Design an enzyme around this catalytic site. Structure first.
Site, short mmCIF file in Angstrom:
data_model
loop_
_atom_site.label_atom_id
_atom_site.label_comp_id
_atom_site.label_asym_id
_atom_site.label_seq_id
_atom_site.Cartn_x
_atom_site.Cartn_y
_atom_site.Cartn_z
N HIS A 41 115.04 80.32 1.98
CA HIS A 41 115.76 81.47 2.54
C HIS A 41 114.82 82.51 3.20
CE1 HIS A 41 115.64 83.48 -1.55
NE2 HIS A 41 115.27 84.49 -0.77
N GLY A 143 112.34 91.07 -3.01
CA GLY A 143 110.95 90.77 -2.72
C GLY A 143 110.30 89.87 -3.75
N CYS A 145 111.38 86.96 -4.84
CA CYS A 145 111.60 85.55 -4.57
C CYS A 145 110.31 84.81 -4.29
CB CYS A 145 112.63 85.35 -3.47
SG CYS A 145 114.21 86.18 -3.78
#
Ligand SMILES: Cc1ccncc1NC(=O)Cc1cc(Cl)cc(N[C@H]2CCC[C@@H]2O)c1
Ligand SMILES: Cc1ccncc1NC(=O)Cc1cc(Cl)cc(N[C@H]2CCC[C@@H]2O)c1
EC number: 3.4.19.12
Lengths: 304, 304
Positions: A41, A143, A145
């Site tokens: 993503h 942030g 991830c």
């Protein structure tokens, strides 16, 4: 003595953390050898998250659109590929700090340490468990991830988790390092409810053994039970059924304390039925289930 | 979202851990620049621990009696000195992995991470607090002495604790890095009882603010209180008195949530008087006091 929710030393994993930016999105990547692993993503805009077609979105991206920074130095991207829900960015430099590593997919009930990162930089380390509903209860902000979960066996880091998502309920979802999500979760901004979060019975028992080893013995009673009788009570309290495999796994703790596993089950049955009565066990007022039997043996024996 | 008992990333401290052996005793040392810091009881035999005269025992030791090993390589000891309860072993090599560091003495109620070590090797990392009775509730076994406690501010490690002792009650005692014990404890095998372990009120309030930030709001009530009224209840429950300095320290959390500090005090007063009624706050059934207001801001903002 003393018993704490302990995480693995994070140094070997800190040496692998990088920042990955694609367009306007920045998250963390894991740099092992000449490959950087990150959530796919990273290629999405916020509008794309509603109904993303990752294969179609990825077509519009070239190697030079993936900005990978390790510390204050930029890595050159020479290839990119998507494997399930992760991107693998081939870089021209092998990570000099790559530890001995493995990619493992954990079972529900197993624990691991998380090194929470932002912009490729570590913020903290904590211990958590893969819940029976395949979510984790972590501490993650926007942030985070690409932050990873891992276990260490002497000098080999076994990476088991990469953070991808927070569900509307405040619980966390992610993949193994092959990009396969734990549970039925998908990397899309859509309605996704977790499932029943049951208690990891075998871990509760391991933690009761840790309590006895560390002197907290008030909950030990004069009773015993059977697996079938214990499981009737476990079902009622949303606890996972205890199997003979679990009793076998608790064997070393039973040997160390001289308390038979079914006797400890009878203690746990009374704790479920009667409550703690305002008392604590190892500084906790609830039954703790994020310590596996191996975690208890490891912490009580001082494995480095 | 999510709120965990988070430790600092341990890599910078792992790079400083060494094994120190003197005679038959082995423990951990902290190697910073060309000095290795370790508990002075490394020079004692078990018989010496009953009534040690450290100055007299140290006379019988020379530089070559201190065996310092960093990984699998031996460091050459070129000087030794005792500073309070720590030994400073001057070695001929500066630690190439020495981070930017400071030696700080913390106040009761402040938190820090511990990197538990055995034979100079890290076993795990956990977060703890200096208790109001100057003990810590860690997880330490024989051989853990010399393990250190620290905080990190970006790239500077502030070392605040070195582990020395476990009291008969299973609680832990140690020194700052100048060798001064926290509390009245002495490095002798003698009767030493800790003192009342009161609850760190300002930390409980910070944790209630973290709960509201993370969605757990059931405990918020329609009441307010005053510092003097709140402290009457705090005294009864062995909680530290709340001062205006503490209210000021909670200011950023009060601003972020829009909940006045005295309103949160009234919520905490009701929780003390009524109990949790079988409910939980941030996955806990008791009021947590090992998160400072700075810890909450740091974790909720993602400081790296
Ligand atoms: C935010 C966060 C917190 C903790 N752990 C992780 C995260 N981040 C995520 O879940 C990433 C993510 C995944 C999905 Cl499926 C959708 C989105 N949509 C975003 C569009 C505007 C804001 C909103 O966050 C983002
Ligand atoms: C054992 C431990 C556990 C956790 N943290 C730390 C420790 N270790 C210690 O307290 C070291 C220590 C300090 C004092 Cl004042 C006395 C002793 N005496 C020893 C002589 C035979 C065994 C007994 O331990 C040892």
């Amino acid at each position: 003595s003393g018993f704490r929710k302990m995480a693995f030393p994070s140094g070997k994993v800190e040496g692998c953390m990088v920042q990955v930016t694609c367009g306007t999105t920045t998250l963390n990547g894991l740099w092992l050898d000449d490959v950087v692993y990150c959530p796919r993503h990273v290629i999405c805009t916020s509008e794309d998250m509603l109904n993303p077609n990752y294969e179609d979105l990825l077509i519009r991206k070239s190697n030079h659109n993936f900005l990978v920074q390790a510390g204050n130095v930029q890595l050159r991207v020479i290839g990119h590929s998507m494997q399930n829900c992760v991107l693998k960015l081939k870089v021209d430099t092998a990570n000099p700090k790559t530890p001995k590593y493995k990619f493992v997919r954990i079972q529900p009930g197993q624990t691991f340490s998380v090194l929470a990162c932002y912009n490729g930089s570590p913020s903290g380390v904590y211990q958590c468990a893969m819940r029976p509903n395949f979510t984790i209860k972590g501490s993650f902000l926007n942030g985070s991830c690409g932050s990873v979960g891992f276990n260490i066996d002497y000098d080999c880091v076994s990476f088991c988790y990469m953070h991808h998502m927070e569900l509307p309920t405040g619980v966390h979802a992610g993949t193994d390092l092959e990009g396969n999500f734990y549970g039925p979760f998908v990397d899309r901004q859509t309605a996704q409810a977790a499932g029943t979060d049951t208690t990891i019975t075998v871990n509760v028992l391991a933690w009761l053994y840790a309590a006895v080893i560390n002197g907290d013995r008030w909950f030990l009673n004069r009773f015993t039970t059977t697996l079938n009788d214990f499981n009737l009570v476990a079902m009622k309290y949303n606890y996972e059924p205890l199997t003979q495999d679990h009793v076998d796994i608790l064997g070393p703790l039973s040997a160390q304390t001289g308390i038979a596993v079914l006797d400890m089950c009878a203690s746990l049955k009374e704790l479920l039925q009667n409550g703690m009565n305002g008392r604590t066990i190892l500084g906790s007022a609830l039954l703790e289930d994020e310590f596996t039997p191996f975690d208890v043996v490891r912490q009580c024996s001082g494995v480095t």
